[PDB]
Design a protein around this ligand. Structure first.
Ligand SMILES: Nc1nc2c(ncn2[C@@H]2O[C@@H]3COP(=O)(O)O[C@H]4[C@@H](O)[C@H](n5cnc6c(=O)[nH]c(N)nc65)O[C@@H]4COP(=O)(O)O[C@H]3[C@H]2O)c(=O)[nH]1
Ligand SMILES: Nc1nc2c(ncn2[C@@H]2O[C@@H]3COP(=O)(O)O[C@H]4[C@@H](O)[C@H](n5cnc6c(=O)[nH]c(N)nc65)O[C@@H]4COP(=O)(O)O[C@H]3[C@H]2O)c(=O)[nH]1
Ligand SMILES: Cc1cc2nc3c(=O)[nH]c(=O)nc-3n(C[C@H](O)[C@H](O)[C@H](O)COP(=O)(O)O)c2cc1C
Ligand SMILES: Cc1cc2nc3c(=O)[nH]c(=O)nc-3n(C[C@H](O)[C@H](O)[C@H](O)COP(=O)(O)O)c2cc1C
Ligand SMILES: [Mn+2]
Ligand SMILES: [Mn+2]
Ligand SMILES: [Mn+2]
Ligand SMILES: [Mn+2]
Lengths: 394, 393
């Protein structure tokens, strides 16, 4: 089946310049028998290639290209079935963009290409081409954020309690500062939140969820929360199904020696979205009392900026699924960069969660994320503050 | 009940400078007896004001401020319930940011306030760092523009079980119609709801799909030329038959159109209930060469979910985000972000429901270039209606 593949990459600036002549000649000769057409753009630091051919042929080729030592940071932008070829001839065509002025490059692209009967700008491929030509250095990974330049550098269990909590740090690696801590519920045998809640009768889960937070506040009180925020997770129903859950929480945290503003409530958008009605008065009560609110797993399930017109949380936590393989996904890159900017304009704190590799950290940092939660830095620590690991140069 | 209100505004650059000393002292003296406190930041071109007090009190005051001729382009950034007063003991006070070095204004603020975990503080900081970001440029001021019409020939087409009205989608910078959207009408010219109500519930999917032959027939004999035709379809109308896509192909080709000329609008709400089923339709549409738009994007609480799982050719920004965008910092921020994301993904963005020049100007300022709305072109039954264009003064 006819398929289109588009990707972008960068050269190693410390190595000798890539022989574009050899590249394009061998590409051209290899592509024609395989029925591969397309175009390659080069701006001095970055490549941009459009490839058209069968799914199989492009799957084989792209694997070779991904492993090629002539370039790095290969980011896939589009991969789709196609009704017709935009590019004709063949060699692989190549434009050295350093030789073109303003719109000369688009003019040469339009010489031999066909984008159907409607204006070229109605074709996604052409829009991607024009964006690379206009500002291709936008998602060029900076030199200080190359992954290879970095490397990474006690408490008891409490079985007698009905539940216990693990604390995980949210960190700002750029300042080597812990930003806040999230409390994560654990069963009396050290089990996950899913096992904890399976052990509770269905009619008691909401009440358990709210009332377990007493143990989280007690822990946070016994630890030196030195002006650090504590995040807690709650089902919206746990706050809603109570005469005064907000007031209950208030008495609990103040009794533990915390302050309202020190406590942030984390709810997932999937659970928020499905009940605006009852969340508005809960959020209102939480606001007036002085507690904060985060949207957790933003990007997972149903996730929206339109959520923000109704109300604005204090913090958004970008779900691990947008973080996962962000280094190779032009889509995830664009989406996360957009969330970051929107939150800046709205005054909403943004945290990237599930950060497991330096690659993820570097690319998230390149799109404006400064706060991070993940196993790369700190794992959850049962009834205590864990060790934090910091990235350090080389 | 305590509340916080934040807005940013702009000076008139061509008028004599406002005596802010007098303004602020008068403000402070009036505010404090009413239980109102806050601060005013000024950078030479823009104001940023934080107000604190009862919902009633700030409602009343902000209404006076919105109508004050000393400024314009008043955009509200925040209005929320508050637990405590951040500016206790200050009726009003001005900080001229041009009188401080970096960090200096924020350091002063924190000496009479009563921090980066607070949203008001983050918004203050953002104004001090890059307040000019959503400053409406001078050539995009609504008073610098006027609409003028570029004759409509609608017709009744008998013998058909439905009709279609056409509304243009326009690119005003190039004074160009980008595409036409086909909007279904009853045999008597009534609304889509009126059309579908006359059809039996179990046959509505089939009718929705088969009605498109009449949209294609209309576009074909116009002639459509090099323009796109947007048609609206329920995802379920596409699943109903084995070769719904194959049928659409036949019908548009018989009407003399090309696959890449036809674009299918599905509403985000209808896609996100069923990710399954749609993948197989979408595959067939792509292989056939037809294009896809997400309609009313931002009305089902929206898309970040969707874009990883596919990317449409076009997104149409919902009319709710367009409405009052000229006074909503939140809506401006959201639309600006969608525009940037789509640009990066090579997705075409259209703003829907554009009714006023105020909306068009602000939409233009956040990067939108395609527009659909009564400001430019109203739907015309079985024909191409008249189109109005903004022209500069
Ligand atoms: N793969 C990966 N995972 C990472 C990484 N960093 C952190 N995590 C984990 O992601 C979960 C915390 O985020 P969450 O979205 O609040 O997700 C939590 C939260 O929703 C929740 N939960 C925790 N405590 C409570 C609670 O007290 N009440 C309610 N209703 N839910 C809770 O159950 C969910 C799953 O929690 P956990 O098993 O504790 O697992 C934790 C955590 O250990 C990473 O780098 N990679
Ligand atoms: N206030 C205001 N309204 C504006 C403005 N500009 C356009 N509109 C209107 O917004 C609707 C078109 O957008 P839609 O989201 O596709 O919304 C459409 C679409 O969902 C739909 N529809 C139309 N044709 C079909 C169809 O053939 N099949 C299906 N399933 N739905 C259809 O029914 C909806 C109602 O359509 P319409 O009555 O034709 O109303 C039209 C239109 O006249 C504006 O500036 N201000
Ligand atoms: C930016 C870039 C674009 C490339 N494009 C192609 C191409 O389109 N066709 C191709 O066969 N190889 C292309 N390659 C080269 C492949 O990565 C790989 O070196 C080559 O296909 C191996 O073929 P060989 O067996 O002849 O050595 C490209 C490499 C880079 C750096
Ligand atoms: C940037 C700006 C900020 C203002 N802030 C206040 C204020 O906080 N309190 C207030 O009473 N008026 C404020 N005003 C002035 C009002 O718009 C209005 O002129 C005044 O309150 C009318 O009441 P008065 O005639 O009793 O003074 C502000 C005006 C501008 C342009
Ligand atoms: Mn959480
Ligand atoms: Mn989470
Ligand atoms: Mn539509
Ligand atoms: Mn719409």
């Amino acid at each position: 089946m006819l398929t289109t593949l588009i990707y972008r990459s960068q050269v190693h600036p410390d190595r000798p310049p890539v022989d574009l002549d050899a590249l394009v000649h061998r590409a051209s000769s290899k592509n024609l028998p395989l029925g591969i057409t397309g175009i390659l753009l080069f701006n001095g630091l970055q490549f941009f290639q459009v490839l058209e051919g069968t799914e199989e042929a492009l799957e084989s080729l792209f694997s070779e290209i991904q492993s090629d030592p002539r370039h790095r940071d290969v980011v896939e932008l589009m991969r789709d079935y196609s009704a017709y070829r935009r590019f004709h001839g063949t060699g692989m065509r190549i434009l050295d963009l350093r030789l073109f002025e303003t719109d000369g490059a688009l003019e040469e692209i339009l010489r031999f290409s066909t984008f159907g009967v409607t204006e070229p700008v109605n074709d996604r491929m052409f829009r991607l081409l024009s964006a690379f030509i206009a500002d291709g250095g936008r998602y060029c990974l900076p030199e200080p954020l190359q992954p290879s330049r970095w490397m990474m550098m006690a408490p008891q269990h409490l079985p007698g309690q009905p539940c216990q909590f693990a604390l995980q740090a949210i960190v700002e690696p750029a300042k080597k500062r812990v930003s806040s801590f999230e409390a994560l519920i654990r069963s009396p045998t050290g089990g996950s939140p899913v096992e904890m809640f399976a052990a509770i009768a269905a009619e008691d889960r909401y009440r358990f969820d709210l009332e377990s937070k007493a143990y989280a506040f007690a822990l946070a009180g016994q630890l030196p929360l030195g002006k650090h925020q504590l995040a807690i997770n709650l089902l919206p129903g746990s706050l809603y199904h109570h005469p005064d859950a907000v007031g209950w929480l208030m008495d609990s945290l103040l009794a533990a020696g915390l302050r309202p503003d020190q406590v942030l409530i984390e709810v997932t958008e999937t659970e928020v979205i499905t009940c605006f009605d009852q969340f508005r008065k809960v959020l209102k009560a939480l606001r007036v009392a002085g507690m904060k609110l985060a949207i957790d797993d933003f990007g997972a399930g149903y996730s929206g900026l339109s959520l923000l017109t109704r109300f604005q949380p204090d913090k958004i936590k970008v779900d691990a699924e947008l973080v996962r393989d962000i280094h190779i996904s032009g889509t995830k890159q664009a989406i996360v960069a957009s969330v970051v900017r929107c939150c800046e304009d709205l005054g909403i704190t943004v945290v990237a969660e599930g950060v497991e590799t330096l690659e993820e950290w570097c690319w998230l940092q390149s799109v404006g994320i400064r706060l991070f939660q993940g196993f790369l830095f700190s794992r959850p620590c049962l009834n205590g503050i864990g060790e934090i690991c910091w990235p350090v140069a080389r």
